[PDB]
Amino acid sequence: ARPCIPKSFGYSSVVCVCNATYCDSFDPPTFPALGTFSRYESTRSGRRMELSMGPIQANHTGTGLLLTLQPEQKFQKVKGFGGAMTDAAALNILALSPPAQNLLLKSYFSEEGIGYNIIRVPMASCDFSIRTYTYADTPDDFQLHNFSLPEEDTKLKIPLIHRALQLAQRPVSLLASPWTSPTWLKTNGAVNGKGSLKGQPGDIYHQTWARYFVKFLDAYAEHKLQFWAVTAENEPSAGLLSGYPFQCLGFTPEHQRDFIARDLGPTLANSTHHNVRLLMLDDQRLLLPHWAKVVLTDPEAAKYVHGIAVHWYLDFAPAKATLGETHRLFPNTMLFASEACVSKFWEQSVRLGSWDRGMQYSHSIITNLLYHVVGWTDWNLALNPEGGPNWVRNFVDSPIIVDITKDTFYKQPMFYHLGHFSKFIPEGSQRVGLVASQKNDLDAVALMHPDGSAVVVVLNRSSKDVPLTIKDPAVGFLETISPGYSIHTYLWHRQ
Ligand SMILES: *[C@@H]1O[C@H](CO)[C@@H](O[C@@H]2O[C@H](CO)[C@@H](O)[C@H](O)[C@H]2NC(C)=O)[C@H](O)[C@H]1NC(C)=O
Ligand SMILES: *[C@@H]1O[C@H](CO)[C@@H](O)[C@H](O)[C@H]1NC(C)=O
Ligand SMILES: *[C@@H]1O[C@H](CO)[C@@H](O)[C@H](O)[C@H]1NC(C)=O
Ligand SMILES: *[C@H]1[C@H](N)[C@H](CO)[C@H](O)[C@H](O)[C@H]1O
């Protein structure tokens, strides 16, 4: 283990400074002995996933807050956690010296880091690209004879994905999403702005676009990468908006329904990539449950849809009415958060050491977990201090900020807030009930690991310390305190 090297940039908390020869890391995982619990703590004051251990007490008295585990109240199984290998992320990582690149990838993907097991891969260019390109820019190439991967794939994204998978002990799942089709498949003949596919589902435009998904999967498979899932389109509602400034492809829910049923479903099912799962929506949860009803009430579409992908950008938060109602209507269709991102209109894109932006991530993950969501995918894995590069200056924050001039990278509070979940909630973990004895300002969630062991995350977004006890009837009582502006993860064996 190496501790955080803290640095202040004058905001509420510190970043952890890494370079070619030093980065903060964990010792190999270890389980706490029966009758004991592990505690990982991060605080605004500067603690970064610090490990301590306490006893599980046989009984408890007091009127203080009690959180009772309900281990027989069983909910969703977790797919996992990760982020996006954009052109911007890969260009930033590969601008560091080889040893600093390795410590950055280890921070995310190693058991000595925070154990990411998902990577979202854009299909060609998005706003976090330094140019607009698709895989098939030769006009009217319906047979896709000029389909090919540019250097952004073969020199930046694919080599970093291979290195990520080599560092991971957990199996990593790849998720692919397109922003735009070739312009010659679109009504507006442009990568951006208001525009859909030409014609109608079933026709040559729609069959070509479905075949483009298979050519992408074919080209990645030639580079020995296989996908867990693809989304039907990144943010289909964006391409319905006049002057939408970057790469988009408009679909109404009806258009998405018919494209999946007539073209994408059958084309993927008849390919060598038929095991790849399809997620629908990949957009703001405010479009639910309407979008799920339109697509999934058509059995010709539903038979091809594994899941619903949601974005957090416009959450701010009717989770019950959107995520909850959707689960109720379609309980066997998983909900997956495919894009989360932070910033206030009066704040810069990157705020080095923002505890507030950390708290937004952990709060979002807890709310999602409490409303059936199985997985949570950050946006850019890494950005520069301006929040780029980005061909349209749509600059945002990232858990890791690379300073190429200093051969340095900064781990933001967001990285640690994500880590409190990603490191301690492996694939197959199941959310279980956790009931509070009184109204409280805390956010908490409980899950059980595949092996039966318990995990609880407790976030305190208030300034006040909150004494609390966790009751697990199988083992006893965890007496602890949630300090103001802290996040804790608690682990214990149940037998
Ligand atoms: C990379 O970061 C490490 C850790 O902050 C730097 O090593 C420290 O350097 C300072 C100043 O020379 C020493 O006082 C510390 O004792 C060092 N710590 C360790 C663990 O070695 C290192 O200098 C940085 N590298 C560069 C190129 O700036
Ligand atoms: C399209 O493909 C043909 C045949 O392989 C090739 O000769 C030509 O250079 C390609 N066009 C572009 C723009 O790459
Ligand atoms: C499905 O795949 C088979 C075998 O590759 C092929 O012969 C057939 O034409 C395909 N069907 C359609 C409708 O594309
Ligand atoms: C989701 C989100 N708006 C981020 C913001 O950084 C980015 O624009 C993605 O392209 C969007 O899909």
Residue numbers in the entry: 1 to 316, 318 to 343, 345 to 497
What is the paper's account of this structure, in its own sentences?
GBA is primarily responsible for catalyzing the degradation of GlcCer by hydrolytic cleavage of the β‐glucose moiety from the aglycone to yield free ceramide and glucose. Here, we report the design, synthesis, and structural analysis of a range of cyclophellitol epoxide and aziridine inactivators and activity‐based probes (ABPs) for human β‐glucocerebrosidase (GBA).
The resulting complex revealed that 4 covalently modifies the catalytic nucleophile of GBA in an almost identical fashion to gluco‐configured reagents 1 and 2. Specifically, 4 reacts with Glu340 via trans‐diaxial ring opening of the aziridine trap to form a covalent complex in the 4C1 conformation with a bond length of 1.45 Å. Indeed, the hydrogen bonding network of 4 is very similar to that of gluco‐configured 1 and 2, with both O3 and O4 able to form hydrogen bonds to Asp127 regardless of whether the sugar is gluco‐ or galacto‐configured. Overlay of galacto‐aziridine 4 and gluco‐epoxide 1 provides an immediate clue: the O6 hydroxyl of galacto‐aziridine 4 has rotated such that it points ‘downwards’, perhaps to avoid steric clash with the axial galacto‐O4. Thus, one possible explanation for the cross‐reactivity of galacto‐aziridines but not O6‐substituted galacto‐epoxides, is the requirement to displace the O6‐hydroxyl for covalent binding which would not be possible were the O6‐substituted. Therefore, it appears that the placement of the reporter group is important in controlling the selectivity and cross‐reactivity of cyclophellitol‐based ABPs.
